[PDB]
């Protein structure tokens with residue numbers, strides 16, 4: 001049967017945010033109660049829910065009468081986008097044994113035995129718990145990757161899916177890939193609360209927050225092909241995305257990191273001159289088994305509109321024409337290629353920052369595009385000359401300029417157009433904005 005049909009027909013709850021109101025769009029009309037300090041922030045396709053650590057920051061879904069999806073051995077799947085800040089070393093030491101729920105159907109401290117399910121966090125662990133009407137429990141505990149640049153609980157939007165087959169296992173997926181599993185046979189009936197609560201419960205860190213988007217429940221255990229289609233269905237191409245998965249924005253400082261060389265930063269030789277890569281320093285902590293290349297070193301770039309004639313949007317759309325600037329010594333310097341400027345073998349055109357030679361045309365019309373690698377939050381940049389001919393995608397080339405050391409130098413080249421299906425490509429860039437959810441230790 002057709003996967004899109006299966007996904008639609010089996011949906012019994014689906015939270016959407018429209019006109020700054022959270023509601024259920026499944027067709028079953030569960031009631032959604034938004035408490036005063038539940039916040040809305042940018043999400044994977046619109047806005048998302050943002051929860052901070054106080055009693056007022058919660059969203060409660062009161063299930064419609066008609067939806068009993070998970071009682072009496074019925075199979076079910078819960079999915080949602082999740083964004084959790086990178087936990088500091090200090091906070092892993094202080095709070096790393098504190099398990100706190102963020103989404104739950106279990107009623108605690110009341111008459112109920114507490115049956116239902118929960119999503120919880122504990123340090124760098126993501127935990128799925130089921131509890132039946134007799135109080136018996138099953139859990140999945142997923143331990144995140146140690147390299148926080150590539151980890152799932154380290155400030156990027158990631159897509160969670162938990163399937164529950166009452167005759168076999170619960171299975172945790174992240175970004176469509178199976179990450180954890182537990183047998184759940186032997187559990188009895190689940191008698192959960194009429195409410196599903198999105199709230200930090202029993203979190204000891206006052207400064208903790210999370211973001212949750214597209215919360216959804218299905219009345220079957222989705223299979224891997226279904227989960228892959230569901231995951232990719234959300235990756236809308238309208239707007240480009242920054243490193244964290246949020247919409248890319250105009251007039252906002254970003255550090256650039258090449259996807260194909262992710263432990264490199266970008267540096268400027270001098271005003272009017274070229275840019276090149278350097279090695280990023282790393283933070284390591286063996287005791288905690290975390291490490292990562294440090295962020296926020298290197299040049300700050302700003303994307304400006306090329307010549308707006310319609311509506312001003314703060315977000316950058318794929319296909320927008322832009323001017324790219326470097327913010328350096330309290331000014332903004334255009335990035336472009338001068339006519340007849342230095343190039344490698346006449347084809348790999350060396351970019352220049354703040355070039356200003358009198359009488360020399362400087363080509364600076366760019367287009368911000370997403371031509372490849374749908375699952376990765378990366379961007380390509382295309383440069384045009386004054387006759388709107390392509391001078392290439394922005395990438396790097398190894399070589400030397402004058403007597404300088406050998407460097408990986410930023411260029412524009414049309415070579416990349418013949419290689420867009422490659423797994424890794426040197427024209428793919430991460431745009432990384434400074435963010436409270438990632439501070440280097």
Ligand code: NA
Nearest residue numbers: 348396397398
């Ligand atoms: Na090259």
